[PDB]
Design a protein around this ligand. Structure first.
Ligand SMILES: [Zn+2]
Ligand SMILES: [Zn+2]
Ligand SMILES: [Zn+2]
Ligand SMILES: [Zn+2]
Lengths: 136, 136
């Protein structure tokens, strides 16, 4: 589905969008919010959060959309792999524009290359720029 | 790119994601709202509206995400092509799960087959079901 995998010197962990029925370790979500804040503070990142509303009965309801799984995978990688180590992410869907931008900025600020294989392309993020040239 | 095209007996119209600087005819958006409300009336279709929030200093700001271009294309087709005519749509991205369901329901409730060629696959929607078997 919307799955991402991180591969760390042969070792593999899978991540999905937020599922409160199967929560990841809170330490990982804490790292994500910490990285998001540092991106906002240190490189002027405009952090996105998405939500929807459904036309239910007796009024209306809003529902926060869960951030995409590769951001969780990247936070896990920043927690578990050495400083400056390349982060290798595999996705089964095409990386969206907002996640692609997130990856660029992470590669710059945390001084780690990111190699992402999404549905269609290898994206190599180095120092804030991607090998795809932002066409994918 | 968020573009869709409709092809009607060789004639071709392109649709982009909603742009207030370049908006299409009012009749098209009215038809789409009529379709969406008919879906709710007949099958109870959960019509969602998506939003993004970006937190900025001057004013923390919410932006509405605009519906995807193929629903506009389908509304245009329902307006401008004869009853029961097949609707042929081309998209340069993968159709999302919500739009794929929308197409399935339109094919049933408006008695039109839809042939959609997205980024990777031909989807042939007939009577509520797709040739991809909902794996794409
Ligand atoms: Zn994304
Ligand atoms: Zn790229
Ligand atoms: Zn869609
Ligand atoms: Zn299909």
């Amino acid at each position: 589905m919307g799955c991402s995998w991180i591969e760390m010197d042969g070792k593999v962990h899978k991540f999905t969008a937020r599922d409160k029925s199967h929560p990841e370790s809170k330490e990982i979500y804490e790292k994500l919010s910490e990285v998001t804040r540092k991106l906002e503070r240190e490189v002027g990142y405009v952090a996105d959060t998405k939500f929807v509303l459904h036309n239910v009965d007796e009024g209306e309801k809003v529902q926060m959309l869960h951030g995409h799984s590769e951001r969780i995978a990247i936070a896990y990688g920043l927690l578990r792999t050495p400083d400056r180590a390349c982060l290798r992410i595999t996705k089964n869907l095409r990386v969206c524009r907002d996640c692609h931008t997130f990856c660029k900025l992470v590669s710059k600020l945390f001084r780690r290359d990111i190699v992402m294989r999404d549905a269609n392309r290898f994206h190599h993020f180095e120092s804030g720029l991607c090998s795809c040239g932002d066409s994918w």
